[PDB]
C-alpha cells in the first residue's frame, strides 16, 4: 500500500495473508468470507507468463495478522488448503479478466476478535455503493513504494473512479468485471495498492446496515500511486454467481 497508514488492531479481521511455504514468503493478500473459504485474485495462484502455478501444498493462509513478518502467537491462525478453485474463464493471457479465485481450508478457522468474515454483496448493495466518488478501503502488506516493506498491515481509503476515466488512463482493455479507484491528479490526495497487496480486499461499509462488504479484489495496475494512473479491482458482485456455484457444490 503506497501512501496509506498503519491499520488499527482488528480493523480488518477478514484480512488474509497467503504465505509461501518454501521459500517462506509473502505471496499475496486475500479475504475470509466464511469459516472455511478464502477469496483471492486468480493471478495470485496462476500466471503462466511468470511461471506461477501454485498447488495446495505450496502455500499456507495466515489469518488474524497485523505484523507482516512476525509469528503472532495466540493471535494469528495458520490454515492449510484443501482445494483451490480458479475462475474457469479467468483471462491470464490478456488483461486478467475474471481475476478471482477461492480456497477451501482443511479445517474451519475459529472466529475471534482478530478473525471474522467480510460480507459479499448482493445486487442492491452493489447498485447502491459502486458509485463514482464513493470511497472503498484497501489493505495489505505490500510495498510502500513503487520503487518499501511495511512493519504492520497498511490501509488506505480510495474513491471509485468514473468508467471513462479508468478507460482513458490506460491502454489495457477494461471489462465490466473490473473497476478502478484512486484519486485524480487535481485531487491532491494520494494512495494505491502495490506489489504484494494483490488478492486483498477493497471494502465498503454499508450506510444502510453498518456492515462491511467486499466489493473488489486487488488485481492490477501500472506502477503504484502514479499520477493519472488508477488501481484496478476485480468486480466481486459481477462474479458472485460463480462464487455461489463453487461453494454450493463444494
Amino acid at each position: 500500500i503506497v501512501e496509506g497508514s498503519d491499520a488499527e488492531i482488528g480493523m480488518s479481521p477478514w484480512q488474509v495473508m497467503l504465505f509461501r511455504k518454501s521459500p517462506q514468503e509473502l505471496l499475496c493478500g486475500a479475504s475470509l468470507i466464511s469459516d472455511r473459504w478464502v477469496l483471492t485474485a486468480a493471478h495470485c495462484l496462476l500466471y503462466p507468463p511468470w511461471d506461477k502455478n501454485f498447488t495446495e501444498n505450496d502455500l499456507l493462509v495466515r489469518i488474524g495478522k497485523h505484523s507482516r513478518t512476525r509469528y503472532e502467537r495466540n493471535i494469528e491462525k495458520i490454515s492449510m488448503l484443501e482445494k483451490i478453485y480458479i475462475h474457469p474463464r479467468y483471462n491470464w493471457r490478456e488483461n486478467l479478466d475474471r481475476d478471482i479465485a477461492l480456497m477451501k481450508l482443511k479445517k474451519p478457522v475459529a472466529f475471534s476478535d482478530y478473525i471474522h468474515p467480510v460480507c459479499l454483496p448482493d445486487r442492491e448493495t452493489a447498485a447502491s455503493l459502486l458509485q463514482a466518488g464513493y470511497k472503498g478501503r484497501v489493505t495489505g502488506w505490500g510495498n510502500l513504494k513503487e520503487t518499501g516493506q511495511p512493519s504492520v498491515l497498511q490501509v488506505v481509503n480510495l474513491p471509485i473512479v468514473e468508467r471513462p476515466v479508468c478507460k482513458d488512463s490506460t491502454r489495457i482493455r477494461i471489462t465490466d468485471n473490473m473497476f478502478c479507484a484512486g484519486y485524480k491528479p487535481d485531487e491532491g490526495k494520494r494512495g494505491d495498492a502495490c506489489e504484494g497487496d494483490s488478492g486483498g480486499p477493497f471494502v465498503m461499509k454499508s450506510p444502510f446496515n453498518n456492515r462491511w462488504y467486499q466489493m473488489g479484489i486487488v488485481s492490477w495496475g501500472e506502477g503504484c500511486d502514479r499520477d493519472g494512473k488508477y488501481g484496478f479491482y476485480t468486480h466481486v458482485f459481477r462474479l458472485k454467481k460463480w462464487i455461489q456455484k463453487v461453494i454450493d457444490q463444494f
Partner: peptide, 10 residues
C-alpha cells in the same frame, strides 16, 4: 524477514 512458524504447520 519472516519469523519462523511452528513446524506443526509444515
Amino acid at each position: 524477514d519472516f519469523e519462523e512458524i511452528p513446524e506443526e504447520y509444515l
